[PDB]
Amino acid sequence: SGFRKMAFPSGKVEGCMVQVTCGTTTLNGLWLDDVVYCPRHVICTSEDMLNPNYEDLLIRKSNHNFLVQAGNVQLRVIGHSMQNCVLKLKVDTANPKTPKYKFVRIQPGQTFSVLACYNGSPSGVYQCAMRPNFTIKGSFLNGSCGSVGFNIDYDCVSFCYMHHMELPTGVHAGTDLEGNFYGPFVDRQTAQAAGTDTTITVNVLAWLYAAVINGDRWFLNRFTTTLNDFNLVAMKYNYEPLTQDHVDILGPLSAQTGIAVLDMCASLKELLQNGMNGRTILGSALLEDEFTPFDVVRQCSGVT
Amino acid sequence: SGFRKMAFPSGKVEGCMVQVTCGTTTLNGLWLDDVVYCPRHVICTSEDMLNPNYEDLLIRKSNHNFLVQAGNVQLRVIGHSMQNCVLKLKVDTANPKTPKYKFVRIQPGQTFSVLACYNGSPSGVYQCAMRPNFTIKGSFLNGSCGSVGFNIDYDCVSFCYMHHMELPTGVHAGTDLEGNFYGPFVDRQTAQAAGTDTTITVNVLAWLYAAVINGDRWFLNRFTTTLNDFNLVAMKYNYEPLTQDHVDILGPLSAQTGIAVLDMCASLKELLQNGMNGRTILGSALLEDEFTPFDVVRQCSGVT
Ligand SMILES: CN(Cc1ccc(Cl)c(Cl)c1)c1ccc(S(N)(=O)=O)cn1
Numbered sequence: 254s255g256f257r258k259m260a261f262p263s264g265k266v267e268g269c270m271v272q273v274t275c276g277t278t279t280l281n282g283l284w285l286d287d288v289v290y291c292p293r294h295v296i297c298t299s300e301d302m303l304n305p306n307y308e309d310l311l312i313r314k315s316n317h318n319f320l321v322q323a324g325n326v327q328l329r330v331i332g333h334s335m336q337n338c339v340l341k342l343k344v345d346t347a348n349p350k351t352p353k354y355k356f357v358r359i360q361p362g363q364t365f366s367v368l369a370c371y372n373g374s375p376s377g378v379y380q381c382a383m384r385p386n387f388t389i390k391g392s393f394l395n396g397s398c399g400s401v402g403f404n405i406d407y408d409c410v411s412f413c414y415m416h417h418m419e420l421p422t423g424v425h426a427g428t429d430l431e432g433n434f435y436g437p438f439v440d441r442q443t444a445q446a447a448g449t450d451t452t453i454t455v456n457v458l459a460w461l462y463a464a465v466i467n468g469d470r471w472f473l474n475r476f477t478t479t480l481n482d483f484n485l486v487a488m489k490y491n492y493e494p495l496t497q498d499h500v501d502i503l504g505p506l507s508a509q510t511g512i513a514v515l516d517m518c519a520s521l522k523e524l525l526q527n528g529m530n531g532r533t534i535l536g537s538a539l540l541e542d543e544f545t546p547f548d549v550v551r552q553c554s555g556v557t
Numbered sequence: 558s559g560f561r562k563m564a565f566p567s568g569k570v571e572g573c574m575v576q577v578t579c580g581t582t583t584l585n586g587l588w589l590d591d592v593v594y595c596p597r598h599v600i601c602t603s604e605d606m607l608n609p610n611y612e613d614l615l616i617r618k619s620n621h622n623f624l625v626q627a628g629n630v631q632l633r634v635i636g637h638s639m640q641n642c643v644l645k646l647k648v649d650t651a652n653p654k655t656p657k658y659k660f661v662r663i664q665p666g667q668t669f670s671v672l673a674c675y676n677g678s679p680s681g682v683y684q685c686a687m688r689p690n691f692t693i694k695g696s697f698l699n700g701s702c703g704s705v706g707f708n709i710d711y712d713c714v715s716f717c718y719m720h721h722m723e724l725p726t727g728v729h730a731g732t733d734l735e736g737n738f739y740g741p742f743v744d745r746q747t748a749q750a751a752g753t754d755t756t757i758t759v760n761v762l763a764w765l766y767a768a769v770i771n772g773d774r775w776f777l778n779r780f781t782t783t784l785n786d787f788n789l790v791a792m793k794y795n796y797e798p799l800t801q802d803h804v805d806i807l808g809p810l811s812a813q814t815g816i817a818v819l820d821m822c823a824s825l826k827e828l829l830q831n832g833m834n835g836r837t838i839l840g841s842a843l844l845e846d847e848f849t850p851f852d853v854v855r856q857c858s859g860v861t
């Protein structure tokens with residue numbers, strides 16, 4: 254028992270992290286097979302980042318201008334291409350540590366692990382969620398660009414995020430591994446305000462189920478509600494609307510705890526309306542929304 | 558910027574995790590060089606765990622009774638010995654993935670990463686603290702015993718914890734890699750109540766410094782205090798007494814933010830007395846105590 258914000262074991266991804274330098278910009282790349290994926294802004298200088306013309310900047314760059322270092326061994330770059338906001342550097346050596354992998358684009362409210370890296374070297378691993386406004390709340394210093402987000406299903410790493418920037422507001426934006434930004438963000442040093450950071454209702458409900466399953470029961474009440482009634486309260490509190498699809502996804506946890514999803518919604522409704530009154534749930538004084546229903550089942554069932 | 562509860566990258570430790578089976582008990586072992594370390598309770602059956610005589614139980618066990626599996630390959634056990642509460646299984650093969658490593662016994666308030674494992678296979682990684690009552694608040698299901706806690710300094714893994722049990726109260730107890738329990742706990746299914754789970758003051762202060770450094774400034778006040786005055790309030794709130802050693806340890810963060818340690822203590826004092834008033838610090842509604850001053854500097858400086 255006990256419930257922790259758990260990341261995937263990072264080893265399979267550690268074995269893919271390299272350093273990419275172009276001129277005076279160093280950041281991280283992802284080495285899978287004979288391709289290194291990195292943010293295209295690696296080609297950008299100081300004055301370039303205000304309104305960079307990536308096509309024009311890239312013309313001035315040859316394969317030999319991209320310095321790719323794996324540990325303390327240099328990889329030979331035999332090709333480069335820009336796909337959306339990422340560069341693909343073809344190297345002459347397949348990464349011998351390439352895991353089974355996929356590139357997935359995740360939906361807002363889905364969670365993933367980040368392996369924060371500097372100079373192609375891992376600093377730490379943490380779990381976060383794609384926010385409903387398509388930001389993530391990360392831990393990224395200068396040099397962390399090209400750090401990746403991922404999920405693992407047994408031995409298959411699904412890469413879903415590559416870090417590109419911290420926005421003016423101290424929140425983070427990046428791309429899938431096809432180089433498409435999540436949300437409306439662009440790889441340019443400009444005004445980029447995020448939308449409302451709404452709470453991922455279905456995740457809160459999952460986490461309340463985790464709380465029940467690990468003994469924190471105090472917030473269970475005598476009430477029920479309907480989706481429509483609950484959603485009136487969700488709206489008021491900047492919670493994502495709950496859909497029948499979310500109810501279906503919570504079916505497993507509903508079954509286990511024998512608590513109907515709508516009864517848990519009524520518990521969440523009272524918590525929203527009444528607050529915690531100085532009490533805690535799974536060591537938190539706020540309602541946690543970076544566990545998916547799948548995460549709660551995975552952690553409660555001990556999948557490896 | 559941004560501040561996350563970050564674990565060490567787990568790869569170096571993933572490469573050390575094996576499965577140990579004795580009779581009908583399966584749990585995890587740590588394979589370093591030609592030794593596998595695992596909880597001694599691996600030899601215990603259903604009725605054994607109420608008051609096991611480990612010396613007597615171990616007499617009935619031979620090397621061939623300890624089944625050690627690394628991935629899906631069996632290791633040959635050429636010796637076994639009990640050291641305190643761990644078994645050391647000598648195998649005929651050095652772990653080719655053995656990292657540089659040390660065994661350290663940590664002090665309460667020190668943090669470490671856990672790699673939660675089942676059947677010698679990694680499920681997830683998370684950061685926790687040795688509590689002042691020598692428990693940890695983990696995420697451990699049946700089969701997770703022998704999962705380890707560790708810190709990394711560059712390429713050296715310092716192993717500090719091996720999981721042995723969840724106590725009646727839903728909190729966790731284990732040993733250093735010499736097999737000595739943290740705190741008064743024993744590897745026996747008996748009444749084992751934990752002491753007061755006090756808050757790690759020096760860690761809270763570190764985390765308030767992290768908050769300032771990443772822009773959450775609202776709790777900074779016009780006041781100062783003394784260690785003695787602060788400690789009167791700490792006592793009242795089940796916070797660990799703050800010592801001059803803790804002040805010295807916070808010197809780096811004091812310097813950076815230009816906020817004196819005693820001024821930050823006065824901020825913490827008001828937060829204790831007044832509460833958060835529904836506000837948050839680094840996305841938390843309670844004062845976080847599982848970051849050490851060293852952790853805050855490491856994360857804020859991007860050590861790999
Ligand atoms: C935190 N960070 C790096 C940084 C900033 C200031 C200093 Cl003093 C240092 Cl050492 C490093 C950035 C960099 C660009 C942007 S942006 N896209 O809004 O211009 C935001 N954040």
Ligand SMILES: CN(Cc1ccc(Cl)c(Cl)c1)c1ccc(S(N)(=O)=O)cn1
Nearest residue numbers: 254698699722723724725726745746747
């Ligand atoms: C949570 N856990 C395993 C468990 C418990 C009950 C069930 Cl239903 C299942 Cl599936 C698994 C244990 C096991 C022993 C103890 S102790 N040392 O206090 O007796 C505490 N917790």
